[PDB]
Symmetry: D2
Subunit: 310 residues, 4 copies
């Protein structure tokens, strides 16, 4: 693992797992996404991980037109690296999923490193009523859902998006995902540095037990040595302890309303900025420091803000 | 983990990953499966893990009629526990996959604990020619293949097969599979003892690095304490070191031509019995001992040989 | 490991490793020790780990008369649990080392769980001049020094101090110390709960690599299950990351000028209270909470503040 | 860790922990040591780890004259590398301990990497009577014993024995010993390759739990990368499982009556050769292979058999 002299704080603004019923502070409209992205960047986020939602009901959408209603606006108001999801909403085809990144030609895109069960159905039991008709069926339908990323699908994404100079945020939900990445690294379909994002607490993925983070770092060191950066995200209540653990291990951090709707125990976060501010305070207490957007670009070896199609 | 006073040697006779071109000793016909199963049992295998193949070309098949051409014969010639696959051939639907276990009502059935990429396409590069037309497309098609076991699919299998008194061999290909099992254990859809089979070396699953075995045991201890038995299988050259490691850790062992076509380095195994004999010799050198079929039945708490439908 | 609903912050006020030349803020006199202990307790320290020093030159001393110049004063000004060292100054005999605890009959005493090389000689290279004649020879002499705690010595300490109702802070500097404790636990010379203090970063002990903390917790879980509390201290720059890691793992924390002379990177701590305040802020950011002295007494099952001989 | 293409089998012939009462097959006289060393070498031992004993009563002795009654004889009858203990008998001074290696100028000498409690007193409870007067007091006296290896002592041994071209077998009884070695490696007092011998199961050292071996390998990889060879020994019943684990991990193996008096469960070993033969059979079952003495010399980079003073 390459030691992160300056820590990259990534903010995942809204995602596609949480639904409108779950929090009145979930960013939905393009205008809310811009406002939240800017606030997160101003709090210290060097990178913004972005999904789009239907502006009226919050349903996940990979419509590039919705992305074009916030990407240019974010670019004009902040210098944060704009990271586009290729995961999108649960149930979308690969064509739908790659559309935004293909249209935008971003500096960074997420790249899910394996197929797994992705079960968020238990969340539905916490709510007796739902604001929109799509929410309960969406959550319930995940009991029989696989977030698909076959070796052929990964290779296609790497080839098509790699061609425009995109660098990837490799999302690794389990130990096997590290080995899946090693397969591609050995075939030279991606070049170092590898930005490895370990994901904890999803039902279908690796659990949010600390031993799992240290284990994944040990395996990543064995497979990739000094050619990778560690980043960490964890679901809900696990977010702060896991990203603090990452900082301590010489890694990078991902926070945001996509991953947890809470600022702290029993308290809904009113903004992405609250979580960015919190992890930054923790980092500072540990005598560590954060990366600026341009320091992050140099770490990830991105193509530059001026080379995108927005 | 419950310490295995007597070690269960499971023999996986033929499987569905290896193809006829790869070895002339791959058991194909029902008569070959009976002969091999009996030899494996006589060498010390307490349990036989079974798949069927098209008798003419070796193509994987979950036709219950093919199973009925070897199950009664095995039952009459050995007292080994007959474990029926619910994985079957790669590309089969869940209906096809559950058919043999539903017809046979076996003491044990395999139960795959999560969805994963299952890529055996690299095997094709080792052979310039193939005996049968189905082999190359089968292997190549795995680049875009997911061995599907959604939470809904797992629950269906547990409910339908649990109803006939079947005990499961829980196949865990990655750390997330342990957490997937814990979900069901917490909901009481399966009762202890849990026979956990950790699977190493599949491209799409956890790699065959020793640290992965000890890590999975640590996590299983945290999730299940004294309610589980550890078993281990590893692909190809990793088979013997991994099953020896399992024995040393107080676990059980799985060998067989399903998992490795080799008796030792650079030597094709002429029979399943060769591998069973080898692991038994290693066990004996370590001052350990193997379980008889009935000792295995008492460990797994099976319904008994007389309660099956064959 | 028993989960620490409320975290015990222990403050090690001065120790015997750091010398006066190293910081003008090192507490030396009994009056400085009282002032510092009170400030640390008021900042949130539930327990104070105490050593004495020669009031004129700061040389470590296990003279019970020096302890009696701060113990009654601390008892009157705070309700913090007073933990007396049985380690004392490097080079002292066991008779000298046990004298303060034997005289004071404290609620808690430290108990070093094994013999190890204890080399602090490298610290001398950071200073071209020393305030007092004893400092350089003290540090240099540690190259050929063993902090002695033989099985006979440990048994004597446990027997003599156990007789007065003392509970022990078991100081474990390496993995073997856990096994040394297990030997005594199996012989029932100490009763649960076991307050295990893992010590990282001493040359001669286990290094300050995160993997070592998680490993020691895994081994402690195997040896002691639910009968122990985890506490952690780390030398110098490692203090804050290690105690934060402990908090995240469900453990307790030890800070203080005994272990690190710094408040943060490149900044000498002016008081023990600075470090207590810092770890408390980190704890609060993680949505965790600290234990009051009486909550700590209930956790450790101490004899009570009124049952000491001061 | 450097992968051991050929495995070095070291045979520790007699040691100083086991006493004559414990087995009639314990090698005592110089003639017995020669006979046993030759048998062990002929069974496959590339290296012989040697201690001397009083020929009449078996009491440990570091008298160089006793070593000269077996070293020339071993050199003439086998080409095995002769490894001389600098540990010797428990209770000896460093002067006594270094005498044999200083006189012999061997290719290899053992080098204990830290001070620890070394308690073998529990062995006495297994015997109601003892053959010789020295045995019970020797064992009982270990309750209050430290195997001393201070940083000054280690440096002296490295300097004095390094001067004659000796390579060291670094005996590491706990994780802290790895860090102790790193201190010397960083100061260039020893040059690569480092032959690291991890020692499990001594009361006062790290316990014989498998996790401890994998952990020590992880730490050694972090501290020394590709500059070291792993070797393993374990006490009594732990010997075979631990050395088999080492083989599986790409390490080397140490067996012998010094470490275990047993050939297998409930069976006293009649000769060192029995254990060498057993580990060699296990190695061969795993499709691994052993090193010849000269292959071992090339691995360890020894000065050659002709450059010793015997
Ligand atoms: Zn996302
Ligand atoms: Zn199968
Ligand atoms: Zn202290
Ligand atoms: Zn020895």
């Amino acid at each position: 693992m390459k030691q992160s002299k300056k820590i990259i704080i990534t903010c995942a603004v809204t995602g596609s797992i949480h639904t409108p019923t779950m929090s009145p502070y979930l960013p939905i409209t393009p205008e809310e996404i811009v406002k939240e992205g800017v606030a997160a960047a101003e709090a210290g986020a060097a990178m913004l991980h972005l999904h789009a939602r239907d502006p009226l009901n919050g349903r996940p959408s990979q419509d590039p037109d919705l992305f074009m209603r916030f990407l240019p606006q974010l670019k004009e108001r902040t210098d944060a690296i704009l990271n586009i999801t290729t995961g999108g909403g649960l149930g979308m085809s690969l064509d739908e999923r790659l559309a935004p990144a293909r249209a935008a030609r971003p500096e960074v895109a997420s790249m899910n490193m394996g197929s797994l069960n992705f079960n968020i159905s238990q969340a539905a039991a916490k709510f007796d009523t739902f604001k929109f008709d799509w929410e309960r069926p969406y959550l319930a339908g995940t009991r029989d859902f696989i977030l698909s990323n076959t070796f052929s699908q990964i290779e296609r994404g790497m080839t098509e998006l790699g061609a425009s100079g995109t660098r990837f945020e490799f999302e690794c939900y389990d130990v096997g995902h590290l080995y899946n990445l090693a397969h591609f690294v050995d075939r030279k379909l991606v070049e170092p540095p590898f930005f490895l994002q370990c994901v904890f607490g999803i039902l279908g993925g690796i659990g949010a037990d600390p031993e799992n983070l240290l284990h994944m770092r040990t395996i990543a060191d064995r497979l990739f040595g000094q050619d990778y950066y560690l980043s960490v995200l964890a679901a809900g209540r696990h977010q702060m302890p896991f990203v603090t653990m990452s900082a301590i291990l010489g890694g990078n951090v991902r926070v945001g309303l996509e991953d947890s709707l809470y600022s702290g125990k029993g308290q809904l976060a009113t903004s992405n900025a609250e979580q960015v501010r919190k992890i930054r305070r923790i980092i500072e207490e540990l005598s560590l420091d954060i990366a600026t957007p341009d320091e992050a670009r140099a770490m990830l070896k991105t193509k530059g803000a001026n080379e995108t199609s927005f």
